[model samples]
Target chain A: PPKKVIIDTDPGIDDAMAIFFALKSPELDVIALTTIYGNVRTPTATVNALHLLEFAGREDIPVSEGFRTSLRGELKERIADFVHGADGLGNTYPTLSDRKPIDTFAPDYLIQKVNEFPGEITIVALGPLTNLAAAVECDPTFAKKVGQIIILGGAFQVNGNVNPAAEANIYGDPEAADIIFTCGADILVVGINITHQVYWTGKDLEDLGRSDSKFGKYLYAASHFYATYHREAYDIDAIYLHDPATMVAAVDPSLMTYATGAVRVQKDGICKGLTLFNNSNKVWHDPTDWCGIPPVKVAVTVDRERVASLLKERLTAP
Target chain B: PPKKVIIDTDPGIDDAMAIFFALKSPELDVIALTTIYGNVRTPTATVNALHLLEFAGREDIPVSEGFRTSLRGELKERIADFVHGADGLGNTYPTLSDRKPIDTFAPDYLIQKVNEFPGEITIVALGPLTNLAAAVECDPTFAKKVGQIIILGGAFQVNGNVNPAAEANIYGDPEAADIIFTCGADILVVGINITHQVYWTGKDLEDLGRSDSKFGKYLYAASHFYATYHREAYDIDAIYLHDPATMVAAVDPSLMTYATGAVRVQKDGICKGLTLFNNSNKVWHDPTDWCGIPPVKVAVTVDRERVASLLKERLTAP
Candidate 1:
């Protein structure tokens, strides 16, 4: 039987790929799609999620909108238009009025689903953790109720994509990240240290487009702008498989190597949103010295070839 | 006119050297000595401070005790007995009942001193920031009234003395460290990154002992355990000038190179007590994103030769 899962997302270009990957993989039964602010605004993210779901013929999967901003501050509303395009999907599709998000709020829906499934639901968070933090705040036991939380954020031991010390998703809502980290969840952090290890060349996208499936062609069309941006900004011929790589890790934990440690998010400062992990053997005197909290497994190494092959096979499948 | 300053310290082996260095330097007006828990418990630190003052024939200088533990949780009461010795000063000096700390508490003394001198007082914090944090909590504007905070904690780019991500002072009470960092003071962080640049060989100690000053011989005696610990643990024949280096930077800021950034201390997790600095050029959108707070100056490089020369010249001065 496929494992039940929920994808908390912001439908940027890579988020679209991750959604498709989850939908196509028989190993995962994606129960719901929750959208939050990140590569674009919450509204845009919701619209893109709806379009992607319709395109993948998975409209049966419910979509919901989450918090517009983080918990402690106003949304700088930093939209990654340069990478994900103005509308978060290369601005290729017009507004789709036909498909609207479900009536339930993202956090409420998440809390409900987790409570209903109770240790049967896995949460794959691919955007800012605002919604998850809200859910945890609403229900103190929300984190523990869920089977696991696979987070696609942070940059451990690597330079962040957004800043020297912070990745975009974690930096976007650092307070939210902090709350989720301390919420007693069994977490598997899939940070950029491993995500950046996998990339998709233009040939890979071309191969996906050659498949007879409509989902493959749609992905190829939507990824063109993201790929171009990567080429121009990073001077690379390929786009990074960040969100999709997280999906692969969730399906097969063996694709990655992990280290257990207490993770913290810097809530304020130039390093705001920086994720710091402690992997030392020092026995602290203070019980609250991160030793008081349960440690989470953080992905340190990944089988990039295997992840890339799995992504390609899933996305290109008819 | 010398800079009027207060030394907030935990009288470990290096702290004894730092206090003697400050007393011997004519460039600083040593106003008061505030003790906290670090190399030993707060009670032991207070005793050591009193003895050091009396041994240097400066018992007229006021001494006070600060927080027995950190801002949050029970004091795991971590003492670096292996380095500073069980009594925090090589266990050479017997408990002195002749002198006692001032009736006023350390935090109260700090508040009064800073308010008394206002913009003229510099705080040389050479241990965990518990007293400073208490003062800040007591008076919301305490940090602003101070001239500058020269902190001897943190490990910006180097491995911490206590753990992989935390220096001993900051890790001792990370919540207190966090409070002090965000307290709006003009901070000069002299972390292990620069402190480790200056080291003293056994010959240096012998050279100091040869001086005719009682303070010099006292430092030479107190530092033996510290030097031996370094030799055995790190295979280094010299002890890194951690606290003394901060004294040098406070007296002569030009002896060190600096970078400006908003610094934050992790309050929880494996990296709890880790001091993270943000020196990037990225413009954060949120006004509260460490950007709203003024950036603190962090010492990144040091003139080891100049610092050593200054220490030797001042401590050996007849």
Candidate 2:
């Protein structure tokens, strides 16, 4: 039987690719799709999620819209239009899908799904954890009931993509991220430390284009903007797989090596959104002792070649 | 008549010197002394403050003990024992003074003092802003009632004394610092940007020792430990007069040039306790907009020769 999984995301270009990756993986059942504000606003994310589901011929899957902003304050709202294009799909705004999102609010739906599945469901969070936080707040037991949570955010031992201290997803809603971390769910954090290790060169895209699957063609086309961003920002011809890496780790945890530790999100300051880890019982003066919070499995190493090969094979499969 | 002033401090070696500077200044009347944790624990700070006041023969001025830790979390307690000596006053510990701190708490005393002489009290804060923040929380009008606040914290446009991103005082209690900045007082930030410009060599200390005043001898004695720390840390024989610089600025604002900005303190992460400023209307995603907070006068340039001369003249006066 396929493992049950739900994806909470903001449909940036990589989000679109990640959705397809999850959909094509036969070992997992893509349960529901929920959208939130990141890479674009909540409304655009909703539209983009719907478009991707339809484009993948998976409109049968339920889609729900989540929170528009972070738990408190106005959303720091950083849109990666430069990387994902203005519409979050390389300027190729697929026409609005005729299919509408389910009426269930994303957080509420998450609670309902987790309650129904008990310990059977894994949550793969590919964007800010606002919806997950809201669900946990709405239902205190939400985290405990869920089987596992694989998150693609935070930078523990590496420089952040956004600032010297923060990744965009965790930084986008640090309060929300903090809530989710303290919620007691068994969590696997696949941060930039591991994701940056996997990259796809232009030749890899051409190989995907040569594959028979129409999904490969769609991914190759959508990646033009993403590849351009990597080329300019990092002086690299290839793009690092950020969101899809989360999906990959969710499917095969063996693809990554882990360190267990109590983690914290910095809620304010120039380092807002920074994720701090204390694996080594370092004396910290923070009130929580972080030890009181449940430990998280942090990815410290990755089998980049094996993961990249898996992505190529899975993405190009008929 | 001299302008009435209260000094909120953590009696590190610098704080000891600054207290003497304030007491020696004919243009400023030392009204009260309050202590908080910074270079040492709060109890140590309180004891040290009492010792300094007695040593200066100004024990009549009220002294109050402030918060033991920061406003939130455990104090990110950083004690510069090596720089200030294990006892925070060149390890001399100044034989126990019979004097006791006022029964009123530091924050309560601050509120009472400001209310007693509305718009007439100048607050020269030379440590973490915990006491001031506590006062503001206790009374919203505390900031508006004070005539001026001169802070010896932050490292705007310069590297920090504590970390690459934070000065010790601000980093000690970033949340407290933030509260004080937003409380709408007339603020003059004498950060490391200007303070580091004023250095005192061994010859300067010897000059103070040769003067007629006993206060000068005390300073020269206290400075030995401080100068040794600077010699090791920066390979400089001279030490920067951090706290005393704030005292000098409070007495004569003309000693430094200024920039105006809405400043903010980062309360978390690796850059925790960092001071950020925006002189222009730069759009920030923070909810308060930082615009609603009143602008603070930030010292950009200092007349090092003039300020050093003033310190020498004042400390040497009989």
Candidate 3:
């Protein structure tokens, strides 16, 4: 059978694209699409997640709404509006098909499912880490019960997209991020340092638009505004895959080489949300807050072509 | 010109052998000898350090006394007199030739010397880590000012001498050991894992005793009681060179290959004073108290014959 997955997402256009791509990929089973706040408000993330399921004709997959804030309980101030649009789905503000999220709390649902299948649930977390942390805080056994969780947050050994030292998803909820990074024994961190290497050109998106897949035409229509930003900001031709790259990596782990060491996130200061990976190659002479913590496998390198082609093949499929 | 050293010794027979060997070796200048409690009481440890200076014709080297208490400000209750004897020096009760230790406390002397020389003072610590940790806590920048410290404590990837998971010196003051390991930037830990590999057989000890070196005959007579314990406990006819192996590495760094990573001492667990090294070879999936700390070079391998021959050449010198 396919790998059982609970896709924890922030429903920006890219996150949505990743969902559709996963639905088509035979290796991954999209059991539930859980929405948390990062690219949008919790309500919008939920709305977009359910609407995507409605449009893709995959309403058999349930949508679950997650926490709206980081650990502080106060909602995050700077939601990523410019990148994902104010409406959080390419500004399409697409109408819903009455496909509502389940009544359960996102974290509670996570705990329930993980406990239900102790070592069978693999979470593909692409949202802010608050929901994940809350599950850990609430359930002591949740970390060990869950089979594995792959996170698409933080940048390792490279500059961040948010600032020189911070990444947006990690920066979104660094306090919660630290909890998630430090709590579990089976975490694979897919940093932007590795994901940024995998890209999809406008030519590929254009080709995807012409495909006869059930949802390919809708993706083409939805991503025009998204591509415009990518073109104007950097080179107008290529959009770096975000959640989609991470999801692809989940199915095919060999596309990236992982380095193991203790990782820490800067929760406060001028360098807030910065991911600090203590690559075990050489030890630093002095100890810091980062010392003596359990280590996790961080993606250090990726096969850019392999990741891009795999994501492409799935995205273009019916 | 030799490297300036402050020998923080416990003054058991092996610690005594290391001092004689170090004093004779031209590579190191024994500037001061400070007493700390691991092998015996601080009072007896001080007497042994000063008495060694008196007999070796090196009374000019001041002996400083260390606080017997750990960072808890409470005394360490268990005394290791069974190995060193009632007087803490092979029951020798060696006479002091009107020589006395300096008035300064051990930790204060460490801070003063390190601040005075900045980066030229190296310490060969063969005792409990309390004095060093005290220096660190009292002075904010003491760790940086001291050039380097080499310790004969703990066993990396090997069983401890004291118990299954603990070493004698480390278990003496686990709290202080944590501070010393976590505070400094230039620490070379010479573990029993490395030092135990280098041994001195009874035949070799007999050969050194027959030599006409000023203190060689004295060392031979003192270590006979020490060797008897080793013989009864294990196979006999051989004694592991603890202090001398660490002392040799301090002078000739090439005798052992160093692996670097964050090292932590379990202060309160069932494995208290156990040195846990996170050698950056493979990252663990989960986080524990051992995460994110700075790394120190732990001696993992030692050239046994080279260490033995080197100790023999120096100890046999006048």
Candidate 4:
């Protein structure tokens, strides 16, 4: 049986690629693409979500517009537009006939969907925590209803690129993040501490482009444009595909290493948005524990070659 | 050379006993007794100081009143009456004929005395820091003129009896205590951490009475009366001679072990009178290793038998 997941996201260039991988992967049953404010505004993210599903010929997947902004009024500005270009995927927006739309509010839809699938649906939140906070607030037992929340936010130990503690998803809305952290839910935070380690070079894109499959052509273009952004922004040769890493975790938890411990978000001066894992007692239930947030895993250290090979093989026409 | 010292205090039952030991000890030069508020109000403490000297046969020693109340406001009437009683020292006020009163105000007198002696005098403060704070405020350089300040207040590591974070003297006036702590003066604090350790029994009082001198008889009666009060007040069989231990430190610096560090006073919360020491780095002097504040010598361990024997010998006449 395929593992079920609800991808709560903001459709940036990388977010689109994440959906593509989730839809094509045999191991994952992509339940929904829930939109939020991160790489773009909420409305734009919703439009981007529908367009990606339409482009992938997966118009049957429901699209729900999540939170418009952060809980504390911290708006996710269009910073990724400069990196991912104006349209976020080579300035090219995808659209097709016959697309499915959900009429219910994102938080209500999220709660209802998770409760229906109870303990079977993984919520991969690849943007700010506004939607998750709202969903948990609406249904207090939302954490119990869902299997795990794979968050692509927070940085620990290493220096942050934004403000000292400012990582994009967390910095977007810290109060929302704080609510989600203490919710007694199983969490796996895919932070810069790990995601920054995985990168796709130009040669990797060239190898993907050699395949004549529809998914292969899309991966090649997406990887090339993301690499161009990465080279221009940070003067790097390759781009770190962040959101897809969380998608990979949903398929195979063995592809990562983690330690279990309680983690807190520092809300004060100079340290705001940073995730502090109280790992004083490094207890591990299994090999994968990401600071004591139980059943929480981390890609603390990863095999970059293995991840890249998996993405390439999975995207290739089999 | 023996350390020349001025005993600035409120001759509470304990302070009176400390004066007796300081007078007869060969290690210390008993310069004068400058009275301040601690177990008694400053005016009442003044009367007790004069009477205490008469009892010890040290009638020529100067006895003067220091600050009336805390710098914040007038002293609490209930606290004043409770510790000192109606006439101070259980109405055992000494006759004026036995001791000539030194007609001088405390802060002015302190300045006069310190200037006259220069850097040779150590001010042993066994009471509230009102007079010391005033002296420091009057002439900032007065601290430099004095050799060192050995204070009997604060509980660094241990909880205070008066309040959770306050000793009797410190609880009397916290602001004054704060000033003394941060004034950059040479400060040696005989906190409750050491004082609560040395409890003397009724047999200890009998040993001092065996000396068969005027001072010995006075101390034995005071101790006998004090033990009953200690039992009622603290539910302890033996009384810990708090202030006298600080006096012993002044008499012989070798009687204690010390590590000098910066001391800061906590001015708020349940811990208003708490003194905190910065124990981060090792202290070193300009020309020699033993220069900085003599590192607030602490009697971490005490020889109780030796201390009791010394107290007995010193209180008795030759």
Candidate 5:
């Protein structure tokens, strides 16, 4: 059965690709887009989330703004505008769609939706964990009621993209990540370690530009600016399929192998946002803090080719 | 009305002193001695715990060996002979006691005792938390059923005696220490930062050597070697009342002030056994790993003079 899903995102350049990819894939039912802050300001994310749905001709899917909207709030929201661009496109500030978000807050909409379809909804979190955490706080049973949560977060055993200790999504608001991890649900975390295993080469993007999919050419052109940041920073000609890979993993769980253990996040100091997964689950002579919390799945290995092919095929086709 | 107590110990010169101090105090009922390893091997600690009871003429208090023994076990155990002497009593090698441990393991005994008296008994843990942690594993309700646990552990904000990251008891078994901390009990942890607040001068020991309690002269003599180690290593004429102050706190809970929070121990790394206390309980931007576990009290301030005077007065009063 095709999985029913809510794409929780911030519409980064990769986020745009991930969202469009999910919209195109028959493996998932992209029922809703709940916007939060990460690659773009919350308002810009709402606008971009709405705008992208217009391109896919899916305005029927609800677009709900997360708990941030100043109408001018982007002026203060810190975003990787250099990478995703001034409007979360590739500096190609596309026309804003006329479709507006519903009145419900992101967290409330999440709670309402999960209650409406218990154990049938997966939340693919592609930004900071703020909205999902708020849902848990508002209703402790929210996580257990949902089918699963696929999160693009953490740095795992590798170094974080931000500092030596934290990944950007985790560092964005570590406390929320902690809440999501320990909330007693099936959480499949896709860390930087897993994301780095899959990438789209320059040639891959050029091919994507010539595709006949509704928005393939737009995303191909959009990724040009995003890919340049990869060259200047990582000296790679391609961008790691960070968020898009996570989106695909939600549709096909077998794309990544997982290890299970209770993970704790560091909330303060030099190691803040650091996620320590008790990977080995080695028997300690006694019960440690990790013992009480049930384990979650952390992605350890990925079928890089399979994931990249899946994204390319989905986005390039109608 | 005196607080009924069980002293979980390793019987270093200081552990012996704390045992004697508790034995003499009218404010506590010294019930049993359950041994575990830290300053010495489990078998050696059992012998020391038994022998110390003999000196106080309280051999009736049962001493059950902790979960370590080879009969010839001390042969391989890494002991601090330099500080606590060859036999864990300043190397005086006091005569052995015919009064051996009961057949029950330390963890079992703890569970039995806590179940017997419910909330009227306290366990003053002065060594590694192995035994208490085992009891928790054996019976999940053990922590809540017991009166409380007064533990001498952690380094808090200060550098540790073992390394920059951890205290001896915690570093002794970081896994077990983590268990006890997060086990949801009225746990009041006395870290080195608090213990360092109280000390007995060399003059204080000399006075006890000349006077009152049954084991006064023996402990004063035992401390000679211990004080020398302290003088050589710490450049002090006195010993920090780490264990005794914890023992005293069980009898009178107000000698130290505490801040409450969940604490996690780093099990493996350059920072193994390192304890991070969430002291602020500040509404973190959201719930983190610590949010699930209940709070424990970590000592932040102490009445140094009061603790020292109490120790001096108890031993000096015949």
Candidate 6:
């Protein structure tokens, strides 16, 4: 049987690709799409999430709204809105014509989904962590309920986005992020330091679109727009596919190179939302940097060729 | 020549008694008393000082009003009225006869007096430190000009009166106290730590009254009244002659032990006026329990019988 997974997300253009990849891969049995605050506000993110599920023809999958803001307070405004546009799809609001509402609330839905499957579920939280925070707060055993959590936030050795200290997701809801990170979950954080290496450009988008499938056409449109924004914002030709890289790490762990170390989230001042790494021999003592808290397996480096090839397969494979 | 001394004070009942002792001691050539705010507000302390000089038949000694309030800012209420009564002499308001205002300002007076006497003058500061801070700010060289500074404030290695961290004189204007202590005059801090040891009871007063002359009669009455308030306030049968002990330290240096070390003053919050010993190893390296800022000579002990014997001779000899 495949690993049962739930992608807790904010449906940015990249988050849509990440969700599609998780759904297409045989290695993952994606159980749910939980929306949160990031790339846009929680309400707008829910609309984008429903639209993406329709685009990927996964209308049967439940799309639930996650936490409204960070647990510390309100989430900081998103810079991605400037790049991805207000609706998170280049200001072109895509519509999902047919889908019934899920019976359970986002947090309760996550708990029910994870508990129904026992140790089979792996939770992938790829946004500002409100749903995951709410889930953990609702159930202390939530971390144990899932086999692992593949996160797409925090930088260990690299510079941060929100401030010089931290990346956006951890910075958005630091109190919630801190709770999730410290909750002893088996976590793999695919931060900018690693994911920025898995770049796909316009040529890759054209090739994927020529394959002529519904998923391929949707990915090509998202990738083209995402690449344009990435090129203008970061002055890079390729889109990083940050959230999709996290999905790949969940399905195909062997495709990336990672260094396990002790990580801490700093939640104060201008340097807020930074993930600090201490690799002292006294701290990160083994194959795992198990500091009696959470076991944070950080992807310090990624195999670019394998990750890019996997993205193509997820989009065009029969 | 007798040591020329300027006594900066607020004539709290004890301050008045201290002036009496300085006047009676032949070893000190009484120069002037620069009044400041500590036991009393400045203006009233100035008035009380003039009256005390008149009562002691030493109106020849000049008196000047020093700074108004504490160095940091103004205070809400007057302490002298509450503790020492309105006259600052414990209800014994002496007549102000033959009192003439001093010609020079307090700092200018200090500077001129020090210049005139060269290395022979000692500044005995018995009140809060506004005047001393002003003098230091006005003339940087004033520290070297004076012979020594004998202060009656601060306590270490013993309980504090105002708070666990402070004593009255050091507490009155800790910032000014800090400036004066660090400015590098030969300093002897006669804090409550040791002065509390030199208590005089009703029996000691009775002995002084029966022992000899008019000076003895005055000493007996002053000590008798000083003990009364102390008994009521601290529940102690005897009164510690705090300010007078500073004078005694000057008259006979051997009456108490001595150690020279760096001292600092704390200047804010509920514990405003306080002197602290710089108990760091780099400055003081005497291999003793007293660790921190070099252990300059601190008077660890005093010979009480010897001090009493010396005071008896000084008062009764005439």
Give TM-scores for every candidate, taking all chains together and pairing residue i with residue i.
0.63, 0.57, 0.55, 0.51, 0.54, 0.49
Interface RMSD of each: 5.4, 8.9, 16.3, 17.5, 12.7, 22.6
DockQ-better candidate, 1 vs 5: 1
Best by lDDT: 1
> Model 5 over residues B1-107: C-alpha lDDT tens digits?
88889888998988987898898888999879999888888889988888777777887899988856322232426655666878888878887967778889988
Best by TM-score: 1
Worst 10 residues of 5 chain B by lDDT: B67-76
Cα lDDT tens digits for candidate 3, B138-217? 99799989889998898675556775445778988888888988895599999887777788899998998899887778
> Which residue segments of model 1 deviate by more than 4 Å?
A72-80, A94-97, A202-213, A231-235, B1-87, B94-153, B156-166, B169-274, B277-318
Q: What does DockQ come to for candidate 6?
A: 0.01
The lowest-lDDT stretch of 10 consecutive residues in candidate 4 chain B is B282-291
Compute the DockQ of candidate 4. Answer: 0.02
**Count of backbone clashes for each model?**
1, 1, 18, 14, 1, 21
Name the lDDT of candidate 5.
0.82
Give lDDT tens digits, candidate 6, residues B39-61: 77777777888877776788788
Measured on C-alpha atoms, candidate 6 has an lDDT of 0.72
Candidate 5 lDDT for residue B33:
90
Q: Candidate 5: where is the Cα deviation over 4 Å?
A: A69-76, B1-318
- Candidates 3 and 6 compared: the better one by TM-score is 3
* Native contacts present in candidate 1, fraction: 0.11
Q: Write the per-residue lDDT of candidate 1 for residues B1-318, one digit (tens) a residue.
A: 799989999888889888999988889989889998888899988888998888788878999888897877557476547878888887677657678889899999999988888999999999989899989999999988999999999988555678666798998888898888888898999998788789998898899888987778878888888877887756777889999999998788999889887777767655667777777444543443455556789898888999999989888887
User: Between the candidate structures 2 and 6, which one is better when assessed by TM-score?
Assistant: 2
Assess chain B of each prediction and give its TM-score: 0.95, 0.95, 0.96, 0.88, 0.95, 0.88
Clashing pairs in 2: A269-B266
